[PDB]
Amino acid sequence: GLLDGKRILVSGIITDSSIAFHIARVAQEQGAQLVLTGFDRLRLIQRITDRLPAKAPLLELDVQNEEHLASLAGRVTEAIGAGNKLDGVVHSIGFMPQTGMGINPFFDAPYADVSKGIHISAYSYASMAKALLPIMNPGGSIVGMDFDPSRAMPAYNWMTVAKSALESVNRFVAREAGKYGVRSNLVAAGPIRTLAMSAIVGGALGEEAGAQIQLLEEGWDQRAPIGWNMKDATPVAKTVCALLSDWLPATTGDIIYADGGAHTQLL
Amino acid sequence: GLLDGKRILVSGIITDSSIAFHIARVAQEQGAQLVLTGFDRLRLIQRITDRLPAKAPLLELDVQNEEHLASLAGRVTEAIGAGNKLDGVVHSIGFMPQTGMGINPFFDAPYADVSKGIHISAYSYASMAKALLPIMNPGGSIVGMDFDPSRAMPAYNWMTVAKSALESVNRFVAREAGKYGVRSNLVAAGPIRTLAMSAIVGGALGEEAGAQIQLLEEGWDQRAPIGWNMKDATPVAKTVCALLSDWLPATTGDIIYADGGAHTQLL
Amino acid sequence: GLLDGKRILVSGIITDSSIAFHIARVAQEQGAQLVLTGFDRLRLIQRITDRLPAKAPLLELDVQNEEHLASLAGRVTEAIGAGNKLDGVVHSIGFMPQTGMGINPFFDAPYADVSKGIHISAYSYASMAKALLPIMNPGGSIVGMDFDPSRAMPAYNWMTVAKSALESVNRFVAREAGKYGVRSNLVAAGPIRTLAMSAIVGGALGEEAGAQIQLLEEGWDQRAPIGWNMKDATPVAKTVCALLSDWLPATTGDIIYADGGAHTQLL
Amino acid sequence: GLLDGKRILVSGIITDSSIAFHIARVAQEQGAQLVLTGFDRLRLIQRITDRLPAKAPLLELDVQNEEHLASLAGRVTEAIGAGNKLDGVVHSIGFMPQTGMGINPFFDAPYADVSKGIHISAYSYASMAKALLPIMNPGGSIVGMDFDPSRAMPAYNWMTVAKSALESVNRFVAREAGKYGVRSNLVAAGPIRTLAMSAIVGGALGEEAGAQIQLLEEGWDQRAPIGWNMKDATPVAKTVCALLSDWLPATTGDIIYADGGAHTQLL
């Protein structure tokens, strides 16, 4: 297995369509021993993760809760055993209030809403690294999930801004992680039909935002030289596992694009 | 004059070494009629701006104050006269609490501090555009001040993250401003010895942060094919005036580098 | 005038739809004294440039002719008078054999054809700088024409590769030009309906290449927050004049996008 | 093994310090069956590759020889057996005449020399893809070697321009390769002390070019958050193997940086 013997923490599972669910599945298929973290609905998350190939301890983590973060390392060590450390950390956490996405005009999002989204989607990447680097082995790897924000797009709005901040945060986390012999990188995925994404395309945030997202998705498969299947998160999961392995040992502070090549093509 | 007849709002003057002071001076030398905005110390700012070549009305603007923003357009129209609109807006506003810069470790900045810095340094670019676009003429231009955040650097820390967010915000403001026939762009300046910057180099945020900033400044002049004079903000001011003029009419959502060419060179 | 008193060489006029024709027109409107260079059809070019607002000497320059380049500085000094130097140089030269563009497959262009296109479109930017920098004044400016090659696109094919090379060449020319106090920059224009471009859209290089170019053009105006008029080269000409002026004095080795903002937007 | 059962062609071995030698070693350690290609000194190359963990057929390939390219697919199929196809292709080929590198001024390289370097270092990536894609399996992968050319640097000179062209070529090769279900990507390596590189640092291309290269190398390890060992090509080889594997299945037209993270950091 690509990850045989590695101990890896995976955040961000909420449904069976979560990108993190497929990261966890593939990592377990490749021999990794997982610790999972979940937010708010731990009963639901436990029922979801019961469908993974192997059992994994589930710990509560609200990345806005300073007490959850202060205790996280101790709770992880309790789960994997004293004297054992983590080899991998997966950040698959994102949120932006609906005022900062959708048909609500970009100018109408209040800063309280934007700040909450930047807290959860960008600052928390630094928060998790701060908490977990002291229990990470040399040669370890931290990976977060990104959506290419280098150009503006309709509807994504403030979530795009949060991803631009996350990319900048990743470059500073790499500086800190390097002192531990640990890499830090993001995977910029193409669009994936999660429950939330399908709801938006169905009009949950207004009709025009739904129409814009659908047009965005269609251009992606058209641009990608190898195509793009928004219903299949497995290529994204494999790319995360690649970064968690020892096979990209000189890459850090960086972004790997698991997007079909779409960002390399204009039309 | 390059800006003859144009009515331009300039934020961000606090001392005579403020980049915005030199923007205002050059704009007035080029025939623009200015409205100035200042934060908190309006008595001091008035005394400072008395040294500009021409008198200009000064309005109070704390970009974190929703009431200041809601009234800003009316106060500007009162200053320039009913029936007159703005042709230009200059955002020269930035702040990050010292916990997010300097020798305080990157991981030790609390999110309340980071959020305040992102509010003032990035979100407020959208806030000012929201307030002023309804009183801007077609062909108008909004310009904000940037510091290239595409790579991490020592000490800048969370302020770098805020600039990454600002660049993303600028691309969305351009979408909105375009409906008004208005351009939105940033000027990414090289380092300029403002009062705050000189204090940091003198050790105000710790000795190692001061040493890192000084090394950063020295490499800049070395890399710049035409050199870089951190004691001279006039080239930055002229570049802002270029974007405020009619001579870059097909550039928007973009970044112009007034940095000596340093960002185009590795060594 | 923006360029009053400046002596500026402009290459690349071949028809009245040439981007360089509009650069020359606007520069003369702004008070510049021009020297023109033309390739192969000097009788035709003279008849074309007779329609410019002011007379200008026309010199023959085939950038593949080492003898033309070796004599160019002397012929320019003879035209503007001994003791006078150039303040500006405009490179508006590009060519790629049809085997390297159009419906002919990317893999089918022979290297002899590609090499000729890279010679004319990229290496010659260095060739002209080598020839003219010794007769350029401090504070001078060299500008070349670019088409954003950061992503692949249909039909442009090897010409895209040549533009990627040109952008790299520009960064090295800036290093050399800086020793003379001269800036070097490119303007990346949106698509402009020159005679050659209209012929391609009409099917001169095959129907599918024509269809691809037309779709490329349409997406450009759609993406540009301020729109894009491919029939109007005047915004591109003004941006070149901006770089030729003294109003971007700290920008070199760089690229200014005169494209409506289209490259800052995904959809 | 990461590459068990895969049939992979590796070009570019000339000494035991060649990056391609270490690519081949690691690929064989990971179970790949190799076909090697060599240029000009096949007796020497055979003696060198005798030290690889497994025997591999060696075929002559001068990428400037149209007859070598026209026959290459048939010679590969003869080596791996009829009915078998390649799963991987490694382009590790580069050359620029000394007039285009070193202390010889950038402006003094004749175009004949530059054109030869661009032929070997950039066009040949398309040439090899044209030759080998018809005998490549779906899910296959083409990888070429890159050195980040996004900023100019001393001494690299025209070789930097060639790498900028190669990056553009890679994006078009991905378009073609996608029709075969094949990915195309580059690995941008940090500096590696090959025989040629050590000779340049020793002054083979002039003293100042040697001094500039040494300073470039030292800044690299300083910038890299995980450090950079120019004497160890193994991290670069592993990254190439990662791209040759099935673990980056949604990445194409792209660049993976195996450089210690140095390109993500300013100082």
Ligand SMILES: NC(=O)c1ccc[n+]([C@@H]2O[C@H](COP(=O)([O-])OP(=O)(O)OC[C@H]3O[C@@H](n4cnc5c(N)ncnc54)[C@H](O)[C@@H]3O)[C@@H](O)[C@H]2O)c1
């Ligand atoms: N779906 C896409 O198209 C796409 C593309 C690229 C990147 N991404 C990114 O991938 C990440 C995962 O998102 P997803 O698509 O799988 O959707 P998701 O809804 O399945 O996952 C979001 C996760 O964030 C977690 N979360 C929210 N608030 C939290 C908090 N306070 N503390 C801890 N966790 C919290 C959710 O509980 C949930 O598990 C996100 O960063 C997302 O931006 C998604």
Ligand SMILES: NC(=O)c1ccc[n+]([C@@H]2O[C@H](COP(=O)([O-])OP(=O)(O)OC[C@H]3O[C@@H](n4cnc5c(N)ncnc54)[C@H](O)[C@@H]3O)[C@@H](O)[C@H]2O)c1
């Ligand atoms: N000095 C440099 O080296 C440099 C380089 C590039 C960009 N910049 C940017 O240029 C901008 C101007 O900074 P400066 O260098 O001239 O320093 P400065 O201190 O002179 O200007 C900062 C300005 O921000 C204003 N400000 C702070 N909080 C505010 C608030 N709540 N509301 C309104 N205004 C507020 C200050 O009052 C002050 O006028 C900043 O965005 C800065 O990041 C500076």
Ligand SMILES: NC(=O)c1ccc[n+]([C@@H]2O[C@H](COP(=O)([O-])OP(=O)(O)OC[C@H]3O[C@@H](n4cnc5c(N)ncnc54)[C@H](O)[C@@H]3O)[C@@H](O)[C@H]2O)c1
């Ligand atoms: N038209 C567009 O859409 C567009 C967009 C961006 C950039 N550009 C660039 O702008 C430049 C000008 O092109 P244009 O669009 O105006 O088309 P054009 O055909 O009008 O200009 C091309 C010029 O190149 C010159 N030229 C060709 N071979 C030459 C040689 N051996 N020596 C000297 N000159 C030679 C032609 O004679 C001609 O004057 C080109 O670099 C082009 O790539 C064009």
Ligand SMILES: NC(=O)c1ccc[n+]([C@@H]2O[C@H](COP(=O)([O-])OP(=O)(O)OC[C@H]3O[C@@H](n4cnc5c(N)ncnc54)[C@H](O)[C@@H]3O)[C@@H](O)[C@H]2O)c1
């Ligand atoms: N050494 C570094 O620091 C470094 C860094 C990044 C990338 N690279 C790239 O890695 C690649 C491999 O270079 P290297 O460092 O290992 O040096 P090298 O000298 O070992 O390899 C160069 C190879 O190019 C081959 N070659 C030259 N002309 C050829 C031709 N006409 N046909 C076929 N092959 C030809 C040589 O025979 C030789 O095998 C190059 O593309 C190089 O630019 C090197």
Ligand SMILES: O=C(O)/C=C/c1cccc(C(F)(F)F)c1
């Ligand atoms: O980060 C996230 O959770 C969302 C990612 C995403 C998914 C589908 C479409 C888009 C769009 F905005 F590009 F349309 C974005």
Ligand SMILES: O=C(O)/C=C/c1cccc(C(F)(F)F)c1
């Ligand atoms: O945005 C600001 O106000 C500060 C900009 C700045 C000034 C001098 C040095 C640096 C450094 F961080 F690069 F060193 C940054």
Ligand SMILES: O=C(O)/C=C/c1cccc(C(F)(F)F)c1
């Ligand atoms: O450089 C040139 O002369 C051509 C530029 C150009 C003009 C119109 C369309 C396109 C396209 F390839 F994007 F379609 C390119």
Ligand SMILES: O=C(O)/C=C/c1cccc(C(F)(F)F)c1
């Ligand atoms: O591509 C190549 O073969 C050379 C790559 C290389 C190796 C060492 C140093 C440098 C420098 F130019 F950055 F110094 C480049």
